[PDB]
Design a protein around this ligand. Structure first.
Ligand code: 9E2
Ligand code: ZN
Length: 258
């Protein structure tokens, strides 16, 4: 009886195994755009993905991850609110059963159809496992998805999902360029938070882009064909794998833009 997204193991239950669920810097949050303060000291975000080396795509039973070789100084996030250099390790999405929900962060209570998380670890801690034990260990770049025109740079991901329908399936997924998932603008909000799935560790500087990307209805429909269950188990579609907004408590959300 491990954690998931259902009535009996979903977000409202996670605090029993992971008491930090009720902590002081949990994610996601609602971004109140009128209360977020423009901070002219914030730097432009530096996203340098020219040398990113995707390796593999994995259905891990809660989402799918596109994994990167993070053994060298490649694919890194700097600037913005960050001190020093953060290296890309994986990306994944959260999405809904319907186009009207799926994002983890919300904007003035608006839910997007999905949310992309590009996960990076602070190179001062040497690798990901040590970084998650630190309050400035990770930087997650969050990007909203709305349904409209297709995102051509997403299609390679969509097309491999049939090969990882079920929990534990992976496929080689080399040469995927995450630059194709980025909107035009790097305007962002930022706040201190947590992992949005167990273990819910309070180690993340969240950077949420204002501009969503558009994906087609057909692209997101293919996300919704994935399964939470393993092969030869009763089918439970992988949908609504999002945690709701958590209390802001004593935090300030800062905007990079006026
Ligand atoms: C904790 C841990 C360790 Cl340590 C390892 N490892 O292999 O070294 N893997 N993981 C798993 C993990 O929880 N990651 C995670 C990343 C991003 C998010 S999100 N939705 O972007 O906030 C939530 C969870
Ligand atoms: Zn996530």
């Amino acid at each position: 009886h491990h954690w998931g997204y259902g009535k009996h193991n979903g977000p409202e239950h996670w605090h029993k195994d992971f008491p930090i669920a009720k902590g002081e810097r949990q994610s996601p949050v609602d971004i109140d755009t009128h209360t977020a303060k423009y901070d002219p000291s914030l730097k432009p975000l530096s996203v340098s993905y020219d040398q990113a080396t995707s390796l593999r795509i994995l259905n891990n039973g809660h989402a799918f991850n596109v994994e990167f070789d993070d053994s060298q100084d490649k694919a890194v996030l700097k600037g913005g609110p960050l001190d020093g250099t953060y290296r890309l390790i994986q990306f994944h999405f959260h999405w809904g059963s319907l186009d009207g929900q799926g994002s983890e962060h919300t904007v003035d209570k608006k839910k997007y159809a999905a949310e992309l998380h590009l996960v990076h670890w602070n190179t001062k801690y040497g690798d990901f496992g040590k970084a998650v034990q630190q309050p400035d260990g990770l930087a997650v770049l969050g990007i909203f998805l709305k349904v409209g025109s297709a995102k051509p740079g997403l299609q390679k991901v969509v097309d491999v999902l049939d090969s990882i329908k079920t929990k534990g399936k992976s496929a080689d997924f080399t040469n995927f360029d995450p630059r194709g998932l980025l909107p035009e603008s790097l305007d962002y909000w930022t706040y201190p938070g947590s992992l949005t799935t167990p273990p819910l560790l309070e180690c993340v500087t969240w950077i949420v882009l204002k501009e969503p990307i558009s994906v087609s209805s057909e692209q997101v429909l293919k996300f919704r064909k994935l399964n939470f269950n393993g092969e030869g188990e009763p089918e439970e579609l992988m949908v609504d794998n999002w945690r709701p907004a958590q209390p802001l408590k004593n935090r300030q959300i800062k905007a990079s833009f006026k």
